[PDB]
Design a protein around this ligand. Sequence first.
Ligand SMILES: *C(=O)/C=C/c1ccc(O)cc1
Length: 125
Amino acid sequence: MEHVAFGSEDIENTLAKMDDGQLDGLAFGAIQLDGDGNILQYNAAEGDITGRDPKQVIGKNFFKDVAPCTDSPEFYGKFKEGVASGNLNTMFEYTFDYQMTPTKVKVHMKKALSGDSYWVFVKRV
Ligand SMILES: *C(=O)/C=C/c1ccc(O)cc1
């Protein structure tokens, strides 16, 4: 397991340019989205929480396709505001309930260092 904690202050530096294998070593779920919400990376810990197959979701749109319960002001709306400002950094709890047992989580969405890239980190609460 990579020795990185959820919520750490420089998480975007520690995870910068991590390949898929390295991302699979985190204690928490990690998704990388483009500015439209298309899925670029999705780790094993996230697939274990949500049931999704980390290989199959790459290229799908998170808000339109995979996670319609996040297509709301409280998740997608916050994401797109942070994308626009270039300073996305928000941590909030949320419930995931599309075609799954409702699962309450803490979400941390933060701009990635790579261009047109945004992290969504997830752990259970
Ligand atoms: C609501 O539809 C949430 C769905 C969901 C959240 C996070 C994921 O990694 C996958 C699906």
